[PDB]
């Protein structure tokens with residue numbers, strides 16, 4: 001890429017957020033934590049009204065479907081996942097629509113899957129779709145196709161690579177990257193950097209400066225864009 | 237198949253409706269005709285509460301997106317389709333959710349495309365999804381993937397074939413199938429039968445008794461299921 | 473008023489529709505008939521896009537709440553209306569919002585009750601609200617306050633009187649007004665005119681030309697505005 | 709009442725929250741802050757799933773309408789509040805419905821105004837409505853009638869009085885009640901206690917133990933119910 005130090009990260013013109021499946025779902029995998037989700041939608045809409053062109057990759061659509069049913073799964077578990085995923089995708093897109101249009105923005109559910117990034121025709125089609133959507137002041141929300149799926153991070157890295165984004169914020173649960181497992185002497189967190197780690201290395205080789213923050217920390221995106229020593233930063 | 241005469245069509249246990257792109261969109265391709273759409277949703281929900289297991293194939297999602305934007309396309313046509321398709325898919329699934337839950341039913345947007353019916357892994361996945369959704373008392377709504385698309389009828393025929401449905405109602409604009417173009421002497425409509433025609437022949441060879449009704453006719457599905465001489469009927 | 477013959481009714485600049493409680497609720501009082509409701513919303517939105525300034529008075533909000541619960545009333549009828557009315561008002565306003573914004577219009581739920589038309593302060597406030605809403609290209613939907621209520625037709629007449637509307641369409645179930653009960657010789661329907669009848673006489677004395685159509689008849693509003701001999705017409 | 713010390717507040721069986729007009733609207737009066745609103749909805753739904761019977765009094769409905777229009781007010785401010793209030797009430801009830809049903813709860817918009825608490829017939833009707841709604845496992849949301857209105861706190865006090873609630877949480881912006889204006893020596897915050905102050909004294913005389921917390925403090929309700937020295941507590 002071109003970015004080297006965290007001080008430069010105020011000049012990134014195309015973010016790609018990626019809400020991890022452990023940030024937005026409450027501590028059961030049986031709900032949808034509204035606190036962190038509303039905070040992250042607030043930060044993303046505010047950052048998009050600032051002039052950048054964000055593009056979320058929302059994970060965790062099975063949880064909304066599980067909680068929306070909560071009855072037909074119960075009455076069937078005594079007489080007897082993808083169905084929950086489908087129903088949840090629909091309902092979650094509705095809820096995102098509400099909580100985003102509460103800031104003036106519009107959204108547009110784009111559904112892809114990892115095989116769609118391998119053939120050239122589908123890659124061309126998807127890039128054309130995303131560019132026509134970005135040029136219209138819309139925030140695409142790129143979920144994974146649930147009905148053709150056997151933690152959507154490699155997908156986010158590859159998507160940032162194709163669209164060639166400046167940043168790639170990768171929210172998660174762990175505070176960052178340590179030097180050794182936490183149950184050890186010398187758990188020195190490595191802010192800079194000489195699964196998530198592999199995808200970050202990939203996106204680094206493809207011209208993308210990955211950053212791995214902590215989801216539960218208040219005002220995460222607005223902080224990491226500014227330059228505070230938060231999260232993790234991958235660059236030679 | 238097994239069905240021969242229209243009198244037998246009261247014993248079909250798995251319908252596959254298919255709302256044509258000229259039935260639900262008002263006469264501009266710039267809106268969404270609520271009259272026919274509400275009538276067809278009413279008939280389908282009533283038929284599903286009767287014991288059958290319907291599965292719509294709703295076309296015309298670009299119209300809802302076009303009308304929902306109506307401003308950002310305007311202001312851009314002076315300074316300068318898939319984007320409209322995406323936004324419309326989201327909004328239309330929301331509207332279907334409302335107008336179906338007004339009858340007690342639940343729906344679940346399933347998004348496929350014609351290449352998903354060629355590989356074996358995706359076909360297995362999709363069939364498992366649809367069976368897990370049918371066994372849960374849900375009405376799947378199978379739109380075509382807009383973001384990986386370069387009048388969704390061949391798709392409906394192939395989908396009915398894979399799930400192996402008894403009937404396949406194929407709503408449209410024309411009253412049926414004539415003997416010659418209308419501007420000719422002897423336009424004898426052929427109810428029985430010794431694009432739509434080709435797909436119907438295909439689905440006939442694959443064990444599906446296709447039927448082509450007229451959309452604007454009031455109470456179409458409830459009539460054709462009963463046995464009245466409406467629409468068209470394909471069987472040797 | 474000023475209108476005398478049905479030919480003049482093309483120059484009315486302020487309609488007040490009133491959907492009767494027997495037109496939109498399906499034939500159980502336990503649902504919400506989507507066919508007639510969608511047709512009437514289509515006609516009203518089309519008439520409003522024509523330059524007039526309509527203002528619906530939607531009845532039947534208890535039905536939507538009854539059907540939306542359908543479970544918590546059931547499980548309680550073995551261990552043991554206004555609650556259904558409240559929940560239904562909310563859900564029905566949401567559904568109207570969807571099916572109206574599908575034509576570009578916006579709506580704004582205004583909740584009044586008959587005692588609000590007797591004191592002068594509340595009458596002034598309500599008139600100011602309605603005029604500020606009409607001058608903004610919005611279609612107010614004037615339901616009756618359910619939580620302060622012990623077939624909302626007198627309300628519609630009085631509302632048309634205060635706002636001083638040219639027309640007052642009063643949709644209902646009966647085709648019109650007969651000369652005698654139907655089980656009699658000589659059931660001559662009286663189109664012109666030298667409960668509903670009393671409210672119509674009132675609104676006639678207050679400068680409003682009431683018209684009573686049949687709800688189930690297709691394209692009712694567009695017909696009666698044109699001048700066809702449909703419904704009933706009250707004028708000396 | 710019966711409660712004296714904050715240690716006893718774990719045994720209150722009927723809360724009445726009241727979200728102040730400065731907690732949920734972002735710092736413009738031109739939006740709807742999703743962070744605090746989602747946090748408060750999360751806390752209230754969690755407290756209601758605990759066995760209590762909460763009943764919100766959501767303020768700030770004009771902000772949602774202002775932001776939802778944002779265009780028709782703009783284009784009219786060059787050619788030229790209650791309208792915004794009406795549109796906002798509708799949209800905000802929809803958003804609350806979504807963010808509450810994401811926890812399993814159902815809600816039911818109840819619209820009252822201060823004159824509805826003075827006549828006996830309307831008071832009886834409203835109490836019957838609220839009791840029939842509480843006995844159904846529903847969370848009523850008691851906004852003030854905007855179309856018959858010339859910071860809804862006296863309303864909340866009187867409502868808690870009529871329903872005779874154990875607690876009355878009154879969220880706001882100020883951390884509590886000080887001994888003197890902040891620009892003075894000796895700004896000793898008074899947790900216990902020997903506008904908001906007047907309403908609290910009233911509700912104390914009517915058998916209600918008022919509590920005034922700080923909205924922006926994370927996990928406010930769950931804390932104050934527990935017994936931590938937060939907010940303010942009114943009791944002799």
Ligand SMILES: N[C@@H](CCC(=O)O)C(=O)O
Nearest residue numbers: 058059060061143144146
């Ligand atoms: N269902 C997908 C995730 C879809 C989503 O992004 O919500 C999975 O389990 O991998």
Ligand SMILES: N[C@@H](CCC(=O)O)C(=O)O
Nearest residue numbers: 294295296297379380382
């Ligand atoms: N956009 C697709 C149709 C999608 C739909 O079914 O709505 C097409 O034009 O073929």
Ligand SMILES: N[C@@H](CCC(=O)O)C(=O)O
Nearest residue numbers: 530531532533615616618
């Ligand atoms: N609940 C009211 C009618 C309210 C409405 O207009 O829906 C009644 O029964 O009179």
Ligand SMILES: N[C@@H](CCC(=O)O)C(=O)O
Nearest residue numbers: 766767768769851852854
């Ligand atoms: N519009 C009312 C408040 C209504 C509400 O609770 O949102 C007022 O300004 O007093």
